[PDB]
C-alpha cells in the first residue's frame, strides 16, 4: 500500500488522539482515545491492503517523511512492516493488538438534537485563545436566539458561571434549552469548517464535528443539561 | 479602542520593564521598573479611551494578537475589560491600581553632561554580543578622542578592568573625563537609532536614550566616575 | 586571520566532535573526539596566521556571526584573541593547551582493504532514519554482489541480527567477506558525497570517509569481522 501526504496529515491528527492505531484493509481509518472521550474517522484516497497495529503512529509517520513519497509499504516475512524505497528499506515494528486501544467498529452517531456549525477561523480562535486564558472547558448553549460557545476555567470556576470567552455561532429559533459541556482537552480537531451536531438523551450526551475531511465524536460532561 | 501593531510592539517593550502598567486616556504611555532603574515613555497614534491598569501586560498583549481587525477594546459592565468583534468576545481582568507600580509623573531630563549616539545596528550588536559574552555591565567612557562603550562581566571582573567587547560611538570634542556604568540588565530598549545623553553631578548619574518612537531614562551605577 | 562562511561551516561540524580545538598556522585544520572514536581534517581556503587553542569552539563561531564577515582575527596584547569589526572589537580567551584535547599529528590512513562510496542523499537518509528508529549501530558488509549498510539497535539485538534499516551502496565483486561495525554516535559527518575506505588487519579495524571538503577517520567496533 501507499500513503499520500493528505492521508498522512490526517493520520497525524489521529496520533494526537491515540498514539497508537489499528489500520484495517479498505479506504477507511478510525481511532479512539484510551480514555474513550474522543473518536475520529475518515475516508481516505489510499487503499490499506493489510491489517496491522502500530504502537507509535507518530514516529511511523515521521519515518515516511524520510523516504520517497511513493514508497511501497507492506508486511514483511517476520510479521513486521516493510517500507520499500529506491535504494533502501526501512523496517518498522508491528504491534500486538493487545498493546494499543482501538475501536472494534465505527461509531454510528444518533440523530442530532440540535445542529450548528463553526467556521475555520472561529475554531482557530477558540483553540488559540483557550490556551492563553486557561480555558479548560467550553459550553455550547442557546442564548438570545443564537447558539453560543462559552469558555471557562473549571479549576477556579467550578460552576461555569464566569465565561472568559464567548463565540456566537448560528441562529437558533428552536423550542428546547441546553448547556452542553465539553472538556477542551478532547477538542483535538484539525483546522477547518465543521457542521456541529449535538445530542442529548437523558444522562447521555455527545457531540459530532463533521468536515469534508474528518468526523469527530466527543463525549460531553456530566454537568451538561438539556431539555430534549 | 484599537491598538495598532506599533503601539502593541512598544507596549511589549514596556511589559519587559514592568510586568504591569497603568493606561490613561490620551495618546501617551509611560512606565517604570519596580526598582526604579529604568523609565520609558512614548507618544502613540492610537487614542486610549479609558483609564485601566493591567496586572500582566505581556499576557494581555499576546491575547490581542488573536482577535480580528474588527475587534474593539472596551470597558465591560463589570468593570473589567472586553475585546470584542462582530462574532466573539474576550474578557480580561482590569487590575486594582494598588496591585501594580507606575509613574505618577513623567521623568524629565533638563540637562546633560555629554551627548552622543548609537545606530540601530550597533545597538543590535551590543545586545547580542553581551548575551553571548555574559556581559552584565557596560561603561561609556572617553578614550583617545572618542566615546566608546566597553562591556564586562562584573561577576568575574569586579574592577571592570578586562573588557570583553568594545564599541566606538562618536568623536569626543570635550575636555572632561568619564566612565558611566550601566547595569546591562537595565538596557531594555527596543531596536532603533538613539540619541544618548549622559548626565553626572556628584553622586547623581543618569542616562537618556531617545529614538523617534520612544525615549528612556536609565539610572546608572555607583561605580560610575566623572569630572563634571 | 579571516574566516569565511565555508571555513566556519566546517569548524562547526568539528565542534560537534570535540568542543575544543587547536588552530595551527597554515590552511589545514583537524580535531579528534576526546574518546578517540572520530577524527576529522580539512584543507581550508583561509590562512591561519597564529596558533591558538579554543576551549569552546561553538561559542566562538556564534560570536563571529555577530560581526562583519571580513572582521580581522588576531592575537591581542594580553595573549588572548581579538576580533576587529568595522566599528567595534570582540575579545575571546585563548585556552591553555592542557585544558583541551587535540591530535598531535594528522592521521595517515592505511591503504584501504575495500573501497565504496555514499551519495549525499543516501547519507542524509542514513543519518535521519537512524534517529527515528533508534539505530545505534551500523554494519557495512558485502551482500549479493553489493556493499550495503545495515542499521541495528544493539541494546536489544546484541548479536546484530535484526536489521531495522538497509541501504545499498555500490556493486561489489571481491572475494573477501566483511561485516564492519560502526557506532552511529561517531558518524558526525557533514553533508556531502563521500568516498568510503574500509580497512582491517587482524583486530585493528577503521574507516575513512573522504570528500573534497572534509575527511573523517572513525574507529570501528570489536564486533567487526573480515578476512583480509
Amino acid at each position: 500500500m501507499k500513503l499520500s501526504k493528505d492521508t498522512i496529515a490526517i493520520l497525524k491528527n489521529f496520533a494526537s488522539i491515540n498514539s497508537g492505531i489499528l489500520l484495517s484493509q479498505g479506504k477507511f481509518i478510525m481511532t479512539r482515545a484510551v480514555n474513550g472521550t474522543t473518536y475520529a474517522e475518515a475516508n481516505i484516497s489510499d487503499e490499506i491492503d493489510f491489517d496491522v497495529a502500530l504502537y507509535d503512529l507518530n514516529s511511523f509517520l515521521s519515518i515516511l517523511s524520510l523516504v520517497s513519497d511513493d514508497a511501497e509499504i507492506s508486511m514483511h516475512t517476520d510479521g513486521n512492516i516493510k517500507i520499500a524505497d529506491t535504494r533502501s528499506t526501512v523496517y518498522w515494528p508491528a504491534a500486538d493488538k493487545s498493546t494499543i486501544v482501538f475501536p472494534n467498529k465505527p461509531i454510528q452517531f444518533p440523530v442530532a438534537s440540535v445542529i450548528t456549525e463553526i467556521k475555520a477561523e472561529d475554531l482557530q480562535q477558540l483553540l488559540r485563545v483557550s490556551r492563553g486564558l486557561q480555558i479548560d472547558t467550553i459550553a455550547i448553549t442557546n442564548k438570545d436566539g443564537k447558539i453560543v460557545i462559552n469558555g471557562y476555567n473549571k479549576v477556579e470556576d467550578s460552576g461555569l458561571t464566569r465565561p472568559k470567552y464567548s463565540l456566537t455561532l448560528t441562529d437558533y429559533d428552536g423550542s428546547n434549552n441546553f448547556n452542553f459541556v465539553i472538556n477542551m482537552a478532547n477538542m483535538k480537531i484539525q483546522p477547518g469548517n465543521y457542521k456541529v451536531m449535538l445530542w442529548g438523551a437523558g444522562d447521555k450526551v455527545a457531540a459530532k464535528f463533521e468536515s469534508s475531511q474528518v468526523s469527530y465524536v466527543i463525549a460531553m460532561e456530566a454537568d451538561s443539561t438539556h431539555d430534549f
Side-chain angles (χ1 to χ4, degrees), chain A:
Chain A
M1 66 167 293
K2 294 186 177 67
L3 293 177
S4 60
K5 285 252 174 175
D6 287 301
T7 294
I8 293 176
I10 298 175
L11 279 171
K12 207 177 183 66
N13 171 252
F14 281 31
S16 72
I17 296 180
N18 188 327
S19 55
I21 193 170
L22 173 63
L23 297 173
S24 299
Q25 303 185 47
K27 282 178 189 199
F28 178 75
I29 56 173
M30 62 175 169
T31 187
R32 174 165 175 172
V34 173
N35 64 23
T37 64
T38 295
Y39 169 86
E41 62 166 48
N43 293 148
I44 53 179
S45 58
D46 297 304
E47 181 71 337
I48 298 176
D49 58 16
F50 68 106
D51 310 272
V52 66
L54 288 164
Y55 188 71
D56 192 339
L57 176 55
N58 202 64
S59 298
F60 172 71
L61 299 173
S62 295
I63 264 298
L64 295 178
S65 74
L66 300 178
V67 296
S68 305
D69 305 309
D70 74 305
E72 185 74 51
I73 167 181
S74 63
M75 192 181 281
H76 192 218
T77 298
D78 57 358
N80 286 160
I81 304 165
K82 174 183 174 171
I83 305 168
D85 195 16
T86 309
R87 320 107 157 176
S88 55
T89 303
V90 174
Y91 301 104
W92 192 272
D96 180 87
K97 280 187 176 182
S98 74
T99 66
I100 62 170
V101 173
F102 64 87
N104 66 172
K105 64 193 70 176
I107 296 296
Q108 238 54 57
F109 196 76
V111 52
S113 304
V114 213
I115 298 177
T116 180
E117 73 183 318
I118 183 163
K119 302 177 176 301
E121 305 196 328
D122 295 347
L123 173 62
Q124 188 191 62
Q125 183 183 72
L126 173 65
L127 284 47
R128 296 288 185 76
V129 73
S130 279
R131 272 112 62 169
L133 294 170
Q134 302 88 61
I135 296 180
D136 61 349
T137 69
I138 63 171
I140 306 170
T141 191
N142 61 301
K143 177 187 188 58
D144 292 292
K146 297 183 167 298
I147 298 296
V148 302
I149 292 186
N150 292 305
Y152 310 79
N153 187 315
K154 183 72 171 183
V155 184
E156 72 185 314
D157 181 39
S158 188
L160 288 59
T161 67
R162 297 184 288 296
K164 308 191 68 181
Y165 180 74
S166 185
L167 165 64
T168 302
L169 304 179
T170 59
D171 303 315
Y172 177 65
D173 315 309
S175 148
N176 293 280
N177 300 287
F178 51 78
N179 189 270
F180 300 106
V181 183
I182 292 175
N183 172 27
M184 200 86 302
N186 307 309
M187 293 291 283
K188 311 286 176 58
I189 292 72
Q190 66 173 194
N193 298 296
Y194 297 78
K195 172 163 62 180
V196 183
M197 303 170 275
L198 308 167
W199 170 73
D203 66 323
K204 301 192 170 184
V205 289
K208 177 171 175 179
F209 291 70
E210 180 174 54
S211 66
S212 59
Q213 267 185 48
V214 180
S215 277
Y216 303 86
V217 171
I218 301 165
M220 296 180 154
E221 305 309 303
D223 44 308
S224 300
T225 55
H226 66 282
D227 290 42
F228 316 79

